[PDB]
């Protein structure tokens, strides 16, 4: 490493250039992710579900995980979001407003749902969890 009393500039430059090498820093501070994310820095976003589809489970699990093809209103970007809980796809109908929020992996995919980056939270302005518990 550089070891001079007058080598502060070189050390600052190295950190600046080397810092972007870590993948998480590049995702967080490059700004490419902020443009790309269907939810642009938002915790979640509203959308209309064009198609109710089921995504086959990746191995070794076997299941038709239920998903919705939703067009987010803020960016007009269509996306796939998992409808969580047992048999709760029934509440979702196509042409219905929904709110889609992340799967907790920060844009990554969780478990055996291939290429699913988000989960529906509220359908027709009512939380999905409440409907499955029959609260509403």
């Amino acid at each position: 490493k550089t070891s001079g009393l007058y080598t502060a500039r070189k050390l600052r430059t190295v950190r600046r250039v080397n810092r972007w090498a870590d993948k998480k820093y590049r995702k967080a501070h490059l700004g490419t992710w902020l443009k790309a994310n269907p939810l642009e820095g938002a915790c979640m976003a509203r959308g209309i579900v064009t198609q109710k589809i089921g995504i086959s489970a990746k191995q070794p699990n076997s299941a038709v995980r239920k998903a919705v093809r939703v067009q987010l209103t803020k960016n007009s970007k269509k996306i796939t979001a998992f409808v969580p809980r047992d048999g709760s796809i029934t509440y979702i109908d196509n042409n219905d407003e929904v709110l889609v929020a992340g799967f907790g992996r920060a844009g990554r995919a969780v478990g055996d749902i291939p290429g699913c980056r988000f989960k529906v939270i509220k359908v027709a302005g009512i939380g999905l969890l409440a409907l499955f518990l029959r609260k509403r």
């Binding site: 089921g54 038709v64 239920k66 047992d86």
Partner: protein, 64 residues
């Protein structure tokens, strides 16, 4: 030999009405009752030695 089947299990599960339960003591009273479940009395949580709160052996000494 194994999308339309949403709720294959939840729809077909036997409905059990919840058991009548007497209202528990809340607040510090629950802290007192948890203290009485293990730290005091000790007889409820004992099979002659220290044991788990939901042991099958602890059950049947507590009824269920």
């Amino acid at each position: 030999r194994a999308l339309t089947s949403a709720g294959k299990v939840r729809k077909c599960t036997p409905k059990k009405e919840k058991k009548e339960k007497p209202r528990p003591p809340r607040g510090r009273a629950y802290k007192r009752l948890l203290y009485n479940k293990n730290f005091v009395d000790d007889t409820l949580i004992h099979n002659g030695r220290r044991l788990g709160p939901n042991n099958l052996l602890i059950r049947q000494k507590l009824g269920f």
